[PDB]
Symmetry: C3
Subunit: 131 residues, 3 copies
Amino acid sequence: MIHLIALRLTRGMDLKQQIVQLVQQHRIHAGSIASCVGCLSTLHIRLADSVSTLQVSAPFEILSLSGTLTYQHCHLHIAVADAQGRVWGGHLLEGNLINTAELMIHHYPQHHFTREFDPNTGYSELVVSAA
Amino acid sequence: MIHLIALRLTRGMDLKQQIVQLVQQHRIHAGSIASCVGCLSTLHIRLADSVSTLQVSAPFEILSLSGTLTYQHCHLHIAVADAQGRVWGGHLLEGNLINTAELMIHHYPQHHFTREFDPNTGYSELVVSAA
Amino acid sequence: MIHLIALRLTRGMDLKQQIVQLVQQHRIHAGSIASCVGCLSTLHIRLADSVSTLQVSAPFEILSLSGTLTYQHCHLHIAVADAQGRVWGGHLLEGNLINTAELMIHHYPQHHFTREFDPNTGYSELVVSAA
Ligand SMILES: [Zn+2]
Ligand SMILES: [Zn+2]
Ligand SMILES: [Zn+2]
């Protein structure tokens, strides 16, 4: 059965760090982000070329946060909107500071997500199994 | 156990109003938006500076809708794409009119979300409790 | 009870085709996209005017994927970010090729989603029923 874990984050908290801590705290071995309405005072993302990075200290509304949660690694992608309504996004890094964040995580106790090195990509990739 | 509530919205309906009505109708005290594929004929959002607003009467595809649902308040953020594929988004206001909208809401009967004034923000913020 | 189906997609796979195949394989008559963190080497979307289309062969990070899943039809909308962090999106078409894609689908065994022609729109639209 899918379980819900909800938590409000406050000013100054690091989004990615808080999610990783929540995952470890609840012994989550398989999960995803259900919702994350909120705002940031600092955005820090890795871009689509997998190398460039963007850090901006300005107000951003969090529109969506998607993530594959495993105990040892959280793969999170975010979409945010700036003061003009334009949307930006990419791979979530450390340093994304909350300005509230109404975080909701879905935990899948019956599953076990892990990550194993993939010679074809050069990165550790998702491996799905039953728990 | 997480429950699903699905509803197709039709031309002219107000997105936010329909969600609020659904929440009250089903006595939802804790929930989130599972999905909302569809399109709008009018977009109306509050921007990241928390004051500016954008209203546009043009076709927009709804890409994602995230929300913290409580009986007395729905905090919704939307991401939409215009005719050129560019994405815009922000805090959902009244006035977002459906052009279909395939709405799916997740209800958490075991939880109770409320909102209490936060002197540190000046707004009512999410408070999570067990139901 | 909501069920989770997770699958990692690899290089060259067609996103929409893989989702349709998963839906048919698991006899899903009602479902939605829970998460889809990943990246594409080719983007192909129908835009908000419901006619224009954009196909781009460049790296894109998948930020969010929303979809109404029925056995005979999957209505999917995607939001992706380019190498500069700018977000683009629209109605998912065939031809969106994976560069990984950590796909998670939620199946609703107690529901039955179908699509029936709507004279008011000219398209087949979502009809929700109990299973
Ligand atoms: Zn990534
Ligand atoms: Zn907001
Ligand atoms: Zn569509």
